[PDB]
Amino acid sequence: TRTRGYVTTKDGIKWYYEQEGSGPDVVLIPDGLGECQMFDKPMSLIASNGFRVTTFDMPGMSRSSDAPPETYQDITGRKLAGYIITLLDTLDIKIASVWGCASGASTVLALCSDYPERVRNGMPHEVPTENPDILLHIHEVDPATISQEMAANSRAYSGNVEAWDALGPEVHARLHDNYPRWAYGYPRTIPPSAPVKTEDLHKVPIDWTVGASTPTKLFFENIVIAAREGINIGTLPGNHFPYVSHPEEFAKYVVETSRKYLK
């Protein structure tokens, strides 16, 4: 049964989190929008396969909004990793299979690099290493404009507009307030701090993905990096939000991939 609630960690973040299942741990880190309701459907699916799945709204975002300003400013994968480790400690999650898209992927890599002992296997998806043109000036315009532009962009990168819309009014209202905050704290600092150096990529198993429908140039570098390093690399259906666009396929991937590493 799904549990839903809050926990305040020692860094002051009042986290909204959810959990379902029993068995080895699976952690689902959201993308930059930090909205975990996006994992609702797949979470049940993954949990039903014998895993304890944990997800949460990111610091300062959605229901995890009661957080120190520091936790949503000058964000990097390593910064988020620290926060997540503190959360995992409080939740007594010793080791986990970890998923993450975009800033979430950066966080996955940071975890694999700096906290390898806590990671079974990492599943990064679309690690930002170079922003597209649409994000160049996003941190520079007024909040209403950021929301409007980012709501459109996200929908366009959704991989399934119907499913995107079908996330619901509550989710979309939360996203609306998240966009400006995300804009000021993420796109400028996330890409330059991508943990994609040789030294970050070999401590724990990694299975890397990019969206099947995502324009090649966007995450091209992820592919080259993975291939050059000898890391498993492939695609998932959809674009930036496979968990929303293709919940069944997404769940399958997580389950199958994590299963490879159980002992």
Ligand X SMILES: C[C@H]1CCC[C@H](O)CCC/C=C/c2cc(O)cc(O)c2C(=O)O1
Binding site for a second copy (CB under 8 A): 210-220, 223-224, 227-228, 233-235
Cα 110–14–80 angle (5° rounding)? 10
- Tokens of residue 237, six digits: 């259906």
Choose, by CB under 6 A, the member of 31, 35, 114, 207 that binds ligand X.
31
* Gap sites in the chain (C to N > 2.5 Å), preceding residue numbers: none
| Separation CA 82–CA 114 (nearest Å) | 9
Is residue 33 near ligand X by the rule CB under 6 A? Answer: yes
In the bound state with a second copy, the residue whose beta carbon lies nearer, of 186 and 219, is: 219
| Separation CA 235–CA 179 (nearest Å) | 27
| Least CB distance to a second copy at residue 220 (A) | 6
Expressed in angstroms, the distance from the first to the final Cα of the chain is: 25
Q: Which does 32 bind (CB under 5 to 8 A by kind): ligand X, a second copy, none?
A: ligand X
Q: Which does 128 bind (CB under 5 to 8 A by kind): ligand X, a second copy, none?
A: ligand X
Is residue 157 near ligand X by the rule CB under 6 A? Answer: yes
Choose, by CB under 6 A, the member of 153, 213, 232, 235 that binds ligand X.
153
Is residue 102 near ligand X by the rule CB under 6 A? Answer: yes
Is residue 240 near ligand X by the rule CB under 6 A? Answer: yes
| Separation CA 29–CA 34 (nearest Å) | 8
Task: State the binding string over 178-217 for ligand X (x if CB under 6 A, else -).
Answer: ----x---xx--xx--------------------------
| Separation CA 225–CA 51 (nearest Å) | 30
Is residue 243 near ligand X by the rule CB under 6 A? Answer: no
Is residue 131 near ligand X by the rule CB under 6 A? Answer: yes
Is residue 154 near ligand X by the rule CB under 6 A? Answer: yes
Is residue 242 near ligand X by the rule CB under 6 A? Answer: no
Are the C-beta atoms of 129 and 194 separated by less than 8 Å? yes
| Separation CA 153–CA 147 (nearest Å) | 10
| Separation CA 118–CA 186 (nearest Å) | 25
Q: Mapping DSSP to helix (H, G, I), strand (E, B) and coil, where does residue 207 land?
A: strand
Residues lying near ligand X in the complex (CB under 6 A) are found at 31-33, 102-103, 128, 131-132, 153-154, 157, 182, 186-187, 190-191, 240
